[PDB]
């Protein structure tokens, strides 16, 4: 349901309940809950009607008139009806503040006409002061000067109403620090006021605005400041509704990890996911195209490198991976390469660092593109439109018809895959415009999607224009990734519609023959790791530029909570000795690992892993004999 | 202490424990914990010694030789010593993989010399294959070609050792999915393997590297994927050490708030804290200056506006408020003005918006300075050095001697105040250089700090050059702040060493007479709120430029946790009806408010409060009669 009791603390006892005579907040903090004035504040600070249901100010700004609500009663400490709140109770309160030498008078002493002369003593009768009860329900204030901020003063303790009969009947005991010494017309009764112990309010069931009083009981235990941690301790046990924390105390950091974020996203792993562009499709059993003019224009468009690059630059990876992971986890799985950035290294430089240095040769469009993990560096609508206009003119000189239709199958029963593909259609069509490119998302069963993609071994059966797939490593060398596009044995050629031994026509068109020379020149380096990894980085740059394997994401990046000490476990990306279920070296702890501790441990591990692998590689020389 | 049991899940049963014959990960995930090979991985991925205590490769890269550790034993399922691990066990394992038609052979089939011919069947004797036991503790591999990634292959299941006696003795039952079907030499014993139920490992107490095995017991309950939420549920009950979360499930968001950050910093409040520059000091009972030449040069320096602006631009507020609040709470209390940004508004434009528009008249140094809350916009070391060089030349033409010494008292027993003042000395001296300015932090008792600042009513007793103090509002008008510098009645003049009715000399030097004309012109507007608040914004711009009241911070910004529904409570900055202990309108809830929910509620409240106050101000017209 919803709680109706509020429990917290207070720090200063009220020495007096006479709100007319003192405005120290140790009194007002009680009185503001139990005694109402002319106006209130809403949740936005606006001065809204309280005991005055309406108010007006004269044209000259000197006269303020308040129309009171009629059915409002004063109530005793015991809850018994005393009398009806009348306009004269506002003359009484202000007259009591003057006669009683109140400390809260300087806000209105020189504003209310004739009041300053009455407090100084040069008049002895209150009739001259600019507060009048024109009738039982009309309070009128007259000021010396116009005050645009006057209404902000009517919510002070000095300006509250006081019943004259009760004031004189109780006499010297009026305003004593006990609940029986004042009368109540506000949202709450003061049920208990025990010095250096407790303050208790209970909702007044006859309050005129009882429906806005949503907390029925309020209890404030006395807090001396001797134990700053009693509050967060009581809150954790459920005794307090709220708890102030103190950043300077010796215990703040422990409090921070107990109530801080604990969800962490595992580091990205070695499997790389990408989209395969079918540049040699001869199966159209599942297409949205109608003409052969559309099939032809699509086939020529996909063979154009500028057109594949325009698709690449137009694809919003964050929106695509926000559908599978979180919005907070969307960047945690993005990969802009095929070989992971740090899969190997030479002289402290990661493979992605090497591959990026070879990438700008292919054109200015690769400026600022880093072949890294964690953030989409490829998506660029400006670059995508610039790439497409170049493709548009090349194709338009070949009788190509626009828009280009692109079939992308997806399993209808896979909600995330549908949402992801719909986002792919969205980002590309938004960037390139639907008069240019149309992504035809074809939803279908598990098996027909599978029958035209993953179990369509024969390339001539691959029935799509774009499809998502992945690849993971088998040995600690870039070739385990980069060999999948090998013109004669590459396993990824069937996903592009290319058979391993045929199609020299298509292989030459997409440039896979130039890639083949890059593969063999890199493979020839059997000993020199520097030359070897430099030459494979040239191959990765070709893949990035080719846009045949439009990168999407990696494995890993899954959210989790854990009491495992992170980055103590043995680590590997090939073999079995660093797999996820390897427990040698792993440490456990009693407390949940917080997100901040995990991210600080990850950055330190990243820094140490770089140094360790580099020192290890230098030490490979000592194992020669 | 530290837990020694790991509890989680597994999803695929091992169909076989014969690691030589299959490399499916449903087998390797078990075997990697219980059977060791030549090399391991450390926590960084490096291939480190395992059963081979050292290894070498020939100059041509074709021959790899591994020196085994001697005291390693094979152990039964029961924990009984079987035999000592010898080099021949690596010939046996690879020969078993060939004879048994293993699926994990394609990694090394064409690398190990003569192996491919043996698996194809054109040789029938294993003596031709490039794996040899040169003695009981020397394994030698011969490759067809050099492979810089070869060692990454020796941690695969296919490459693990196998005892020949046990292999032939157990026969057809070898590798069955039961723990008695293999032998153990790795970190763990396989204690239980019940299909679709449990996998249990126990630490092997005789393991050669037992000190790196820090988890004693591992239990993996079978997880079928039928209930994705069983994992986070079991983790919350303490049954699992870790738990994967699934961002697509209907329950992820609830999981996120249960394990997400819950600490929130209350919004900044109306009290403004600032540093008062003593421009008229005639009490030197607590100073670090020695000469009169230093007192004179300091007195003239503080009267220079460029010098006060250089101090202002040089003061790092984030570092100062990182000592009182958190490092995560440091910006949560910063204020760059005297009047709060949104204290009043005209036509949807906040007072800080008005004041900023009047600020750039005073010079280019106020470019990009916003008079807002939340982020230090004043601190600028470039602007501080540019301001000081202008001050340097003006003062150097008046016989002023550098560095300028500035006394700043602080209560020694107040740790935070000491740390804060030391950071003030740090940031200013780092920016301006210690040959130019020196901030002399004078630590002292509670009372002497109090005796020369807050209870030194007479201005001639103010014994400092800079001191921190604050001021809060009494009515909803900018004048409640801006009147404190009034030349004849302003309460803040004594903090600058200026008496309310005297010192026309000093008042004219710092320009407080020009400020006085700004105050009266603004005060003259009794009705037009637009002209009134525009003219007070001109006064605030003068204060910002004067740098007599160098702004520091606000009240509020305190960290807390709460079950209160935020921004339902009545709100006010003057009066008593919106004070912190006002409970009318406040709502409670059962769950702890998370930081994300509180910050989304704050931004929405900020947006609504702006619209509500503006609609309210337009509606003030209907109350005229």
Author numbering:
A (entry chain A), B (entry chain A): 31 to 655
Task: Please share text taken word for word from the publication where this structure appeared.
The five lipoproteins exhibit pairwise sequence identity of ~52–60% and share a very similar overall folding.
AliC was also crystallized in the open conformation, and its structure manifests all the characteristics delineated for AliD. Remarkably, the crystal structure of AliC unveils a distinctive three-dimensional domain-swapped dimer arrangement. The resulting entwined dimer adopts an open conformation, but the width of the ligand-binding cleft is expanded compared to that observed in AliD, measuring 29 Å instead of 16 Å. The observed domain swapping in AliC would be compatible with its insertion into the membrane, given that both N-terminal ends would be oriented toward the same side. Nevertheless, to date, there is no supporting evidence indicating that a domain-swapped dimer represents a functional state of these SBPs, including AliC. The domain swap in AliC results in an extended interface area of 5173.1 Å2 [calculated with PDBe PISA v1.52], occurring at a hinge axis passing through the middle of the loop connecting α7 with β14 (residues 290–294), extending between Lobe 1 and Lobe 2. This loop in AliC contains a glycine residue (G290) that is unique compared to other homologs, which typically have a lysine residue at that position (K287 in AliD). For instance, AliD presents a significant number of aromatic residues decorating the binding-site cavity, promoting the binding oligopeptides with a high hydrophobic residue content.
